[PDB]
């Protein structure tokens, strides 16, 4: 058993295995799967890790051919009330990757721009799970020469614990900055959220922010209904941070090949700068990246929610809802390039696709941030 | 490193 | 969907499902398994809970027909370094059940009896994971009118963390009682432990204690080699706490039927006195009882280590190694009946099988404790 | 309670 040749070999194994599941019986699928399992480790090479999570991904898809075994195997997992680990993974991604640090700086720089001269400010956060994005806002609002404005934030998440956690950290910081500030927590999933029902106090200025939360509507016109509902509030700006990869092919093959291209790039960052034995590295791959991969491969239909698409398809879709593009500023983009120079983050680079920011890793695009103005 | 991203690059050409 | 009739029905489903796995293909096995999964919950009725863990148990056995899927599914679990939960389950069983409280009182009462007039005492603990068993010893040794003896304990476990944890709590208590005391920790699994190699300082008195740790040798004459090795040390007493149920049938059917008879009794204790929604109840069933069931059903051969057998077969086996029975005292047994009167523990009763103690629940025998003297 | 231990008792007689 010799290494780098196994790298190519593993790839061929995933394709050969996937073709049997997609077309025909598992007898030949089991062949490559056993062949894969001896060669893939969660703690080894980058391609060893990659094949560790795709192999289990295809197995789950095979299990769904027999609902009996799948349901029976997943029969003792109900008493699950663990959010403390869930927030731990969100903090790791925040710290170990600049994806969110760049997005947060970019949206707040974009939000500040549309809110010049506004005494009242309303921000809506879909999947408001990380407070540090707004911690930067309160700082910057107080930093501007005019002075802080009255600030309301609406937090959207499916867990009251996180919203209670965000309010506390947010309200305390506001009072210490002498900012009039109000947190309005709404507890609901994103499918069931009604945007129009949301309280709007007139005389306000509205801003909407969606961090990696738009593509879940492509599962369930579920998207176009939602964007128009945001349009119905007349937002000054809507900033959309979204993933920039074609992971929503119709077939398993087209979905698989492009999927591992992207996740291979993400796993490279982790090997380049993190020890292989660190639990933190293992906790993001298995619990964050590896969960995504399972949804892209094992799941299909409405229960498959990753559905990431490239920046172009998002631009058209957003445009169709009567949204105008706001080019991101030259000096907000300089700062993101400045974030990516320091704090390790070697190899990351950002480019501009038509007034929208694209974050890439060694010329492989990963995530896109775009600013949008409400047309008409 | 010897890129894992490069590993698929050479295998996709084949 | 109506309840108590589902109770009978679930039973018939497990047997019908098991017969298909044992003899023939899974096409008919999948039928009952899907049929089972809709009717079994981890959080519901007692028989609902029972069928929740046996259903997943048979599914694992079916998976092992295809090593590809099974290995591929279990491909991301390697970085597991969690003993903190493992000790949590041992403490729960200790607190939620009197199995260990009765055993500990009984062995220490038996050990005290053979160590009358002994100035030096050596105790060997196989799978020394719970310190409270010896905490009772140090107390009682100081309690006797003669005075404490010099005390050495050898601790056997496969995790250095637990032995470091036991020593600390043990040494501190000893110094506060003014007892000469020494902890000798050995770190090794039980298959690989060599009993003869163990340090013996002459002039000592030896005692051996085995709490639910003898039946793991029936997997791998692995048993008779081990008992004679203990015999080779000439122990004053060897006290064996062991489970009292015939869970080591040759066939799946004979192993299954008698298995659920016993575990049905254990689950009754939990429903009688614990709220159904409590995590503590769920953490013992799924993590302790449910793990056992998986080994009894899904596993076979050397990797199946439960192998519990009735008191009679243990009596003969121990006798064959040249061990003499020591009848447990009338007043040690009175105290165990006194433990089972208070602290809830309603319904537990203990009987005597030939100078050995049998703990049962509503006339179903569960665990057996026997005291043995070294013959010749 | 209505014993789960009793549930198998009546079903094993059948």
From Swiss-Prot, chains A, C:
Compartments where located: Nucleus
What coarse category fits the chief subcellular location reported for this protein? nucleus
GO molecular function terms noted in the UniProt entry: DNA-binding transcription factor activity
PROSITE patterns according to UniProt: GRAS (PS50985)
Expressing tissues: Expressed in seedlings, root epidermis, leaves, flowers and siliques.
Which Pfam families does the protein's record reference?
Answer: GRAS
Q: Does the keyword Transcription regulation apply?
A: yes
GO CC terms, sorted:
nucleus
Q: Tell me the segments the record calls region VHIID.
A: 90-155
Instruction: Give the highest taxon in the source lineage.
Output: Eukaryota
Q: Note the PANTHER family from the entry.
A: OSJNBA0084A10.13 PROTEIN-RELATED (PTHR31636)
Biological role stated in the UniProt entry: Probable transcription factor involved in plant development.
Give the multimer and partner information: Binds to zinc finger proteins MGP/IDD3, IDD4, IDD5, BIB/IDD9 and JKD/IDD10.
Protein name (record)? Scarecrow-like protein 3
- Please give the organism: Arabidopsis thaliana (Mouse-ear cress)
Swiss-Prot record, chains B, D:
Q: Where in the cell is it found?
A: Nucleus
Q: Which domain of life is it from?
A: Eukaryota
Q: In which tissues is it expressed?
A: Expressed in roots, especially in vascular initials, cortex, endodermis, and quiescent center (QC).
- Result of knocking out the encoding gene: After germination, roots display aberrant divisions in the quiescent center (QC), but normal radial cellular organization. Reduced SCR expression in the quiescent center (QC).
Assembly and partners? Binds to RGA and SCL3 competitively in the nucleus.
This molecule's function is given as: Transcription factor that, together with JKD, regulates tissue boundaries and asymmetric cell division in roots by a rapid up-regulation of 'SCARECROW' (SCR), thus controlling the nuclear localization of 'SHORT-ROOT' (SHR) and restricting its action. Confines CYCD6 expression to the cortex-endodermis initial/daughter (CEI/CEID) tissues. Binds DNA via its zinc fingers. Recognizes and binds to SCL3 promoter sequence 5'-AGACAA-3' to promote its expression when in complex with RGA.
For this entry, the protein name equals Zinc finger protein BALDIBIS
Q: Which organism is it from?
A: Arabidopsis thaliana
Q: What is the organism lineage in this UniProt record? A: Eukaryota, Viridiplantae, Streptophyta, Embryophyta, Tracheophyta
